[PDB]
Amino acid sequence: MEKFVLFAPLIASLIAGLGWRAIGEKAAQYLTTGVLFLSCLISWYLFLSFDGVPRHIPVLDWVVTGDFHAEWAIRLDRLTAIMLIVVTTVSALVHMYSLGYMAHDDNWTHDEHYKARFFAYLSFFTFAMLMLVTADNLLQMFFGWEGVGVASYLLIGFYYKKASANAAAMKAFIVNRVGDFGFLLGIFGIYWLTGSVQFDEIFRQVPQLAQTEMHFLWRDWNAANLLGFLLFVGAMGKSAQLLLHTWLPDAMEGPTPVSALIHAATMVTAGVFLVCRMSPLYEFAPDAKNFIVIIGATTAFFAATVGLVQNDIKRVIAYSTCSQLGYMFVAAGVGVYSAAMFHLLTHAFFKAMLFLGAGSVIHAMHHEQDMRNYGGLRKKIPLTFWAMMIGTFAITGVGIPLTHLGFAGFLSKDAIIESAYAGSGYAFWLLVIAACFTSFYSWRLIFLTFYGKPRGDHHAHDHAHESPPVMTIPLGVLAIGAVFAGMVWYGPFFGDHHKVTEYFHIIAAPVGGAIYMHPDNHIMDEAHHAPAWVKVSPFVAMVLGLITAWTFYIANPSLPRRLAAQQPALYRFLLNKWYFDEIYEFIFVRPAKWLGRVLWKGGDGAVIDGTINGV
Amino acid sequence: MTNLLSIITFLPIVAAIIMALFLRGQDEAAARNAKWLALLTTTATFVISLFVLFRFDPANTGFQFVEDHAWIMGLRYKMGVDGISVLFVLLTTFMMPLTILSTWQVQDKVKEYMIAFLVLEGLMIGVFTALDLVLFYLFFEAGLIPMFLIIGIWGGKDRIYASFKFFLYTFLGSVLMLVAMIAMYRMAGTTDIPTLLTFDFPSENFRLLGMTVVGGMQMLLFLAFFASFAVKMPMWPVHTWLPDAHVQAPTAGSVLLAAVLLKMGGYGFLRFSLPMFPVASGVAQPYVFWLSAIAIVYTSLVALAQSDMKKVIAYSSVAHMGYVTMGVFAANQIGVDGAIFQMLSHGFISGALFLCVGVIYDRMHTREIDAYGGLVNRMPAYAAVFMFFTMANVGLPGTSGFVGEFLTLMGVFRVDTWVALVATSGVILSAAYALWLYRRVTLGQLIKESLKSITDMTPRERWVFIPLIAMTLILGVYPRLVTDVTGPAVAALVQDYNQSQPA
Ligand SMILES: [Ca+2]
């Protein structure tokens, strides 16, 4: 039954991708879509019926060499069960949503066939991520890690006739390989220190790792801190954290349904999953955890500032994903991993709705993506307007200030900000400031596209009409999670320590549980005792951003123009995204090409062959 | 059946002799007969070699199917296989039928083209079965003759220079090894490889000219064998023959050049260098680690700067063999098994990639990357095959490419972390040039007049790739099929190496 969830999407993708000419594109679309809904149904049954006893389901031996053995296997615990419903539910809805969104695509002439290929990629992308989350060993985790990398490369560059898509897909693959550089080095170090890659066997030896010095390069390091850092480098790339983020905003070149799947369920969340799955190690690696907090906090602040000035609708949401993952890494860094997954679970709901809602806006507006030509539209697409409004309420953290009554992101974000206050003063202030920016650019998105006067060309505005039911029903389903997910799961994830202990079935060896928290780790308890001003600070930051956005686009709509003139250098800085792409071209891309040419003509040509030909 | 290795070795050569004698005519019908006879012979050799594979017993680390006969000049004709060489025999016999099938559209001197490949097959097989020191050298250097003519006759515009560089540069390396082999013959009193695997060659330092020879006679013998195998592998900086020979050769010649002939360098290290010169191997380990690390970074960057599609694939091979050399000299269970798996894996992937170059070369008669673009628009099947083997080339998990790279890197990490870090950068650099080549050739829009009428892969071209796709996936998902065969033999080899190290 666990195996069907894992392998049914793979079999459907192979049939749809390779054999649609035999059965037809329409049948191939239903085959993939129907299989995900069956897998999603089984995923929910596994999640709701889980009894807290982790299960191991062998499949096949993968790599066996001397004392090294890694197997194809399924591990089912609380941590996996959470990821099962997230991956299959969002993937299933994207399949259903895609049936209408890709019904007629202008990127392809009538001669070209694309529908069956698109649905085959979605099913395989799902299979890759299901392999990542069910992994019982680090090696199978790497397979799913690289599987989503190649599956994303196929989908970002789906429109292969566009150079921008091909560049973005290539960039995403290469930047993620830089992350897998560190992740591979972590696997090598873990195996030789512990003699295993299996999670349970690793976690048994973690206490001894914290007292072990391992030589790496020019010096000796604490084994736990070094291996924690190396594995996090892999997570930075997959979650598009600072210095490894530039690929995510360029991934918008793919079809909109791909973005909802990449940004909400599969790729970005994998990095957070790895840290939470490896919490037994990080709880014994204090210095690795500190680095995770700084990167998480800085990414949360960085991506929030950049999104303030973006004019493309999908790029505003893309940078919001980078910012939101910054929050999750702060929670994990301070040692509260349930809060990190609580936000991951709620984020999957309302983020997937923001992209699918944005796609509906793009779908209605003749595939225009620039918010400067989206005036009006509140009345022309009512169901898309309310789907996006609920998503904004969730992401901005709308709720009753001092209670536990509010939208999904109200409860999961306030859990992290309280944890940050008890964990890091640096992180706490960067998170509340970033929360203020989150409200501004979220409400800037709503006001620029749904309010004001119809702006831009009038041909698309007059023809704007609501998307078909096949596209709106998935939005409705997600809205159910974007409203009740936070209140439903607040208790099991963050509410009560005893309740959290049994839910995750958590110095003794840190084994047997979905997550581990060290006995000396009390940040979760201190978070509940945070002062009132700390608990309400997210709300005040939210209102401050909302009022600023309202004063900038509804009232006195000339303020955004005047301010940018007053501060032109800073405006260019944010608009150009802090110039990371330009910097990397200067330091990495161009020097690498120059070095290769010099080695080719200087080394092989003039020095080596020059000598051989000389003699 | 009792002479099973001798049959697979000399059946391809015997068939070539019969073909030369009794196959008359030069018209198309004569050429058609030659192609079929070569295909049936190569297929027969593959089927016979499957009997060796399926009756092979991995637990027995000694040599199996051994046959011994008297020979000339006091030497013995001895053949046999163990867990280290059995899979290279099957690789050689597996690629030959596919290579012949790919040459089905050639019309220039077909009978001689079939004869050259049939003769080459027999000589390539003997390298992996010989258990006599001189006999191994005979097959090792005899293969240079047919390949010298394959490049010269059916090669590109610079084939005359490439053929001479390939022969003389390889011949120069091997003659030094010949003198070392004679010395081992004189010291041990035998050319029997099984006997030499247990002989203790002196390892005490002595002064030769103005330098101390750290490792004694073992180091002198090691260097002679290293010079031969380093050039064959090839290692950096003795690799510059390869971008000439592999590029100027015909498509089929390039398949065998990269898929099989390169493996004779890595197999030599596992058969002679470590088993027979363990002290010298331990001393040379630091230098071999850095030569291999440089090769990965150096040739990966050089591949990124190529304007010629076949030169990207050619330079990719040197980078991949860099992993093999590291794994072999890491001299632990994980490194050595990874090295063998990498060598076998590179055979399928590199062979497929050269066949991918051939598919579009046969249509446009140009290897320039800038001459193509948007082939996916007219060539759907080719774009899918070319992407699959592009992914295998960058070591994507699930393909056989990942397993070999992962194991060699982990074995080296145990010894030297600096080398492991530099070598591990290959994952970043391989993706850079491999994906850039695929994009520039296959993706984009079709805007050139010369490509408006290009055709997709024909049924025969597709069927050549299907066996290569299957093997890459099967070993990527179930590598135990290989590590079970090589496992016990590598463990015995690693144990001997450790026992021989100085105390
Ligand atoms: Ca020995």
Side-chain angles (χ1 to χ4, degrees):
Chain A
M1 164 156 78
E2 300 74 34
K3 287 187 226 168
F4 175 91
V5 170
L6 183 57
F7 293 119
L10 174 67
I11 291 152
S13 76
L14 288 173
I15 292 152
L18 298 170
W20 66 264
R21 289 168 187 288
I23 62 170
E25 292 206 285
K26 176 94 91 73
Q29 292 178 299
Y30 294 165
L31 185 67
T32 54
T33 305
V35 164
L36 276 296
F37 273 106
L38 260 304
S39 310
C40 170
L41 211 73
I42 292 154
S43 283
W44 277 100
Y45 169 58
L46 284 156
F47 171 83
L48 298 169
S49 77
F50 187 53
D51 54 339
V53 186
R55 286 196 292 280
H56 303 235
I57 298 94
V59 185
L60 199 57
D61 275 31
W62 184 13
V63 185
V64 183
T65 300
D67 294 351
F68 181 85
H69 55 92
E71 299 92 346
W72 301 119
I74 292 152
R75 152 166 223 162
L76 195 87
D77 59 15
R78 195 86 257 171
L79 186 64
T80 306
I82 294 155
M83 293 312 291
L84 281 185
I85 57 156
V86 165
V87 169
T88 60
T89 301
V90 173
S91 178
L93 298 159
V94 166
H95 278 77
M96 176 170 182
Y97 176 98
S98 189
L99 287 171
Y101 184 92
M102 314 282 285
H104 191 317
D105 195 310
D106 280 330
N107 292 279
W108 310 101
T109 76
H110 305 322
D111 295 311
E112 289 139 31
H113 297 266
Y114 63 97
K115 284 179 195 181
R117 198 172 64 255
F118 187 72
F119 277 69
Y121 287 177
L122 294 178
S123 293
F124 179 83
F125 189 177
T126 309
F127 160 71
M129 180 87 195
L130 286 163
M131 282 282 278
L132 198 161
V133 304
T134 58
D136 213 323
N137 58 73
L138 275 163
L139 201 74
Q140 188 184 314
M141 189 156 279
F142 191 70
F143 171 86
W145 207 265
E146 291 267 286
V148 298
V150 71
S152 83
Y153 158 91
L154 286 173
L155 282 166
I156 294 158
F158 189 71
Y159 301 138
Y160 58 81
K161 297 191 272 169
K162 293 164 72 175
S164 63
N166 296 318
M170 234 186 87
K171 178 190 215 182
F173 198 95
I174 286 153
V175 176
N176 277 288
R177 266 289 173 89
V178 173
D180 306 351
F181 177 76
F183 183 76
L184 271 165
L185 290 176
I187 289 161
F188 304 151
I190 281 160
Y191 167 69
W192 288 117
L193 286 162
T194 78
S196 176
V197 289
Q198 202 267 328
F199 286 127
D200 291 5
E201 187 75 338
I202 291 161
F203 299 158
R204 179 182 66 80
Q205 304 193 48
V206 168
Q208 327 320 342
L209 288 177
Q211 293 149 228
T212 300
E213 294 284 293
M214 81 166 295
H215 198 101
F216 181 63
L217 309 185
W218 74 91
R219 58 168 284 195
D220 272 0
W221 316 74
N222 190 254
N225 290 313
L226 180 66
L227 299 174
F229 170 91
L230 284 171
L231 291 180
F232 182 60
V233 167
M236 280 173 73
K238 204 63 68 185
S239 292
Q241 292 301 278
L242 196 67
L243 290 171
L244 295 173
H245 64 274
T246 59
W247 69 268
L248 197 71
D250 298 332
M252 301 298 97
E253 296 287 344
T256 306
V258 168
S259 305
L261 196 61
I262 284 168
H263 285 240
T266 44
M267 266 195 131
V268 302
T269 68
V272 177
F273 173 77
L274 175 73
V275 176
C276 293
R277 159 68 77 229
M278 296 294 294
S279 47
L281 188 149
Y282 288 103
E283 283 301 271
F284 288 90
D287 272 25
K289 294 214 295 173
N290 288 333
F291 183 74
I292 287 153
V293 168
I294 292 147
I295 291 297
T298 313
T299 306
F301 180 90
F302 150 78
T305 62
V306 175
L308 297 168
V309 296
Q310 300 311 303
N311 292 303
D312 172 277
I313 189 165
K314 297 177 75 185
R315 267 169 207 281
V316 164
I317 310 186
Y319 277 107
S320 175
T321 296
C322 292
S323 179
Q324 287 306 282
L325 296 145
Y327 281 76
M328 296 170 211
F329 283 114
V330 166
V334 297
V336 188
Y337 306 91
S338 66
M341 299 288 285
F342 185 34
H343 193 42
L344 191 153
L345 179 56
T346 62
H347 173 250
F349 281 105
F350 64 77
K351 182 62 61 174
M353 194 168 56
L354 281 156
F355 279 105
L356 294 193
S360 188
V361 173
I362 299 155
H363 189 81
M365 281 312 276
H366 288 185
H367 289 282
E368 176 69 48
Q369 292 184 353
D370 189 292
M371 281 166 326
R372 298 169 264 179
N373 315 134
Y374 281 172
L377 295 197
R378 171 166 57 97
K379 323 279 217 43
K380 292 181 182 292
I381 49 170
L383 291 178
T384 308
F385 165 68
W386 291 110
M388 298 282 279
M389 281 291 282
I390 291 154
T392 302
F393 290 153
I395 193 164
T396 57
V398 171
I400 310 300
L402 254 298
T403 77
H404 295 163
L405 294 174
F407 284 74
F410 171 65
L411 284 85
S412 65
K413 199 159 85 176
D414 299 352
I416 298 179
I417 281 162
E418 288 165 35
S419 306
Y421 172 82
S424 266
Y426 170 89
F428 167 77
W429 287 116
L430 280 192
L431 287 192
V432 302
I433 293 156
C436 194
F437 293 170
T438 301
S439 297
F440 180 86
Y441 68 64
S442 303
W443 286 111
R444 170 173 179 276
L445 197 155
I446 294 299
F447 297 149
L448 280 174
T449 75
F450 293 112
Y451 285 97
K453 270 147 45 179
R455 173 176 71 264
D457 86 353
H458 69 355
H459 167 242
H461 269 81
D462 297 316
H463 275 158
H465 59 340
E466 184 65 275
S467 297
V470 66
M471 275 183 60
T472 58
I473 290 149
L475 283 171
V477 169
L478 291 170
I480 294 166
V483 178
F484 302 111
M487 303 184 278
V488 164
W489 285 302
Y490 169 84
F493 279 79
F494 196 68
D496 177 30
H497 167 86
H498 158 262
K499 191 134 55 173
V500 165
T501 295
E502 313 304 329
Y503 198 67
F504 289 98
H505 52 94
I506 305 164
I507 297 91
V511 72
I515 51 161
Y516 180 74
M517 280 167 286
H518 201 273
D520 304 337
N521 179 359
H522 306 113
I523 274 77
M524 191 159 138
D525 296 324
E526 304 169 76
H528 304 130
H529 299 323
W533 75 265
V534 163
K535 296 196 174 178
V536 72
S537 69
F539 197 75
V540 168
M542 194 264 309
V543 167
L544 285 171
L546 168 56
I547 293 159
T548 314
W550 188 91
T551 291
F552 270 39
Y553 300 104
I554 303 299
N556 203 4
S558 63
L559 259 178
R561 284 137 20 81
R562 285 153 63 189
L563 199 161
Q566 286 182 34
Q567 297 285 85
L570 183 62
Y571 177 75
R572 266 196 303 282
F573 188 72
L574 302 179
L575 194 70
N576 295 291
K577 303 150 218 303
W578 296 33
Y579 295 100
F580 276 100
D581 273 311
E582 283 82 337
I583 287 156
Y584 288 165
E585 187 88 3
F586 188 84
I587 277 143
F588 296 124
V589 177
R590 274 196 306 245
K593 292 189 184 174
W594 175 88
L595 190 48
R597 180 67 180 270
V598 168
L599 295 178
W600 173 33
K601 309 283 210 193
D604 276 5
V607 176
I608 296 161
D609 277 332
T611 302
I612 285 153
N613 286 347
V615 183
Chain B
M1 188 312 314
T2 188
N3 295 126
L4 192 59
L5 292 182
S6 296
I7 286 157
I8 69 181
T9 296
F10 294 109
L11 171 65
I13 291 146
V14 167
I17 288 154
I18 278 162
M19 179 156 351
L21 282 160
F22 307 129
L23 190 52
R24 201 58 52 231
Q26 279 138 63
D27 52 333
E28 218 305 334
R32 199 177 39 78
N33 288 350
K35 289 171 211 181
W36 274 109
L37 295 170
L39 194 67
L40 296 197
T41 310
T42 47
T43 307
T45 307
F46 176 64
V47 166
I48 299 152
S49 76
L50 286 175
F51 289 93
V52 171
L53 178 64
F54 291 131
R55 319 209 254 260
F56 182 79
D57 166 42
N60 182 5
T61 62
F63 292 101
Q64 302 167 46
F65 305 103
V66 165
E67 34 170 343
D68 202 343
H69 308 294
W71 197 23
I72 57 155
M73 297 195 96
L75 314 161
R76 306 278 304 180
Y77 168 88
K78 197 186 184 162
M79 295 195 156
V81 291
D82 64 352
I84 291 168
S85 83
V86 70
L87 291 189
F88 295 114
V89 175
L90 272 285
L91 176 71
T92 311
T93 59
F94 177 86
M95 305 285 326
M96 283 297 329
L98 302 176
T99 308
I100 297 302
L101 193 67
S102 79
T103 73
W104 217 257
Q105 246 63 57
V106 174
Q107 285 103 18
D108 185 47
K109 309 180 197 101
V110 167
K111 191 188 82 162
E112 299 87 355
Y113 194 66
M114 292 298 101
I115 284 158
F117 277 109
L118 284 174
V119 168
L120 186 71
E121 170 173 32
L123 299 168
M124 275 169 336
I125 297 159
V127 172
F128 301 116
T129 68
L131 294 186
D132 181 88
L133 205 57
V134 185
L135 188 65
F136 164 86
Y137 181 86
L138 178 140
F139 289 120
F140 189 84
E141 56 107 14
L144 296 191
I145 297 157
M147 197 51 107
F148 170 79
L149 296 146
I150 287 158
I151 298 155
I153 296 161
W154 297 277
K157 295 119 91 183
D158 200 39
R159 64 194 194 279
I160 293 162
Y161 171 80
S163 62
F164 272 86
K165 188 176 194 177
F166 167 82
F167 191 105
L168 294 163
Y169 195 156
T170 299
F171 189 68
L172 179 63
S174 68
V175 296
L176 270 292
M177 180 177 70
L178 181 67
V179 179
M181 291 169 150
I182 291 159
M184 311 156 48
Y185 176 27
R186 293 286 92 190
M187 289 193 287
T190 192
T191 60
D192 203 53
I193 282 163
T195 302
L196 296 153
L197 285 165
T198 68
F199 188 83
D200 283 332
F201 293 98
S203 176
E204 184 140 311
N205 300 22
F206 58 73
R207 270 201 110 251
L208 176 143
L209 301 158
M211 290 150 84
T212 184
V213 185
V214 178
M217 262 295 297
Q218 276 201 27
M219 177 56 83
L220 278 189
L221 300 183
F222 173 92
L223 291 170
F225 277 77
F226 183 84
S228 178
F229 300 148
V231 160
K232 200 87 162 149
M233 186 82 264
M235 308 186 54
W236 183 98
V238 288
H239 68 287
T240 59
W241 67 268
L242 178 146
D244 282 311
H246 289 215
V247 173
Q248 297 307 322
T251 292
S254 307
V255 171
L256 302 189
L257 269 168
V260 184
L261 271 76
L262 295 189
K263 318 313 168 182
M264 295 161 178
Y267 166 73
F269 285 127
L270 290 166
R271 184 54 87 214
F272 305 101
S273 295
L274 272 72
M276 284 173 203
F277 320 126
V279 174
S281 297
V283 170
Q285 173 190 84
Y287 307 86
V288 172
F289 276 178
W290 282 114
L291 287 174
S292 307
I294 290 157
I296 292 155
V297 171
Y298 185 109
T299 61
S300 292
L301 289 171
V302 168
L304 188 69
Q306 302 306 302
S307 62
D308 172 337
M309 194 204 159
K310 209 173 180 196
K311 253 142 172 43
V312 173
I313 311 303
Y315 270 106
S316 182
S317 284
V318 184
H320 283 277
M321 293 309 91
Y323 294 100
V324 174
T325 303
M326 276 175 0
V328 165
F329 276 86
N332 49 43
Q333 182 69 65
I334 278 159
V336 177
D337 288 330
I340 295 162
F341 200 105
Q342 178 61 25
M343 281 201 278
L344 298 177
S345 175
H346 185 263
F348 305 122
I349 295 155
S350 73
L353 291 164
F354 279 119
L355 292 168
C356 282
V357 170
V359 160
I360 58 168
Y361 186 70
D362 296 338
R363 289 154 174 74
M364 291 292 114
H365 321 293
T366 184
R367 305 183 303 266
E368 301 297 288
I369 294 156
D370 81 310
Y372 301 97
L375 294 183
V376 64
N377 297 305
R378 307 260 310 158
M379 282 162 105
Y382 170 78
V385 163
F386 187 25
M387 194 190 290
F388 170 79
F389 285 112
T390 292
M391 269 313 141
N393 200 45
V394 305
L396 185 85
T399 76
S400 66
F402 171 66
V403 178
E405 277 139 74
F406 169 80
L407 289 175
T408 61
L409 286 172
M410 185 144 81
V412 179
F413 186 93
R414 184 48 159 186
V415 191
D416 198 328
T417 54
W418 275 111
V419 175
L421 183 142
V422 167
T424 306
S425 308
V427 306
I428 302 147
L429 291 167
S430 77
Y433 70 70
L435 293 177
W436 201 24
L437 180 78
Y438 177 83
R439 177 191 169 196
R440 281 180 293 169
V441 162
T442 313
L443 304 181
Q445 213 141 21
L446 191 70
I447 63 162
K448 290 169 172 258
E449 272 313 287
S450 63
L451 305 165
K452 295 293 181 66
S453 70
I454 204 165
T455 44
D456 200 12
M457 281 202 285
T458 72
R460 179 192 55 80
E461 301 175 304
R462 291 179 206 219
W463 274 109
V464 166
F465 281 116
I466 287 169
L468 295 162
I469 292 161
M471 284 325 287
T472 302
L473 278 163
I474 280 149
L475 303 187
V477 175
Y478 204 65
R480 277 180 63 91
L481 285 156
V482 169
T483 71
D484 287 334
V485 174
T486 65
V490 165
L493 174 145
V494 166
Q495 177 159 72
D496 290 315
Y497 172 92
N498 294 337
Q499 285 172 7
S500 301
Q501 287 318 286

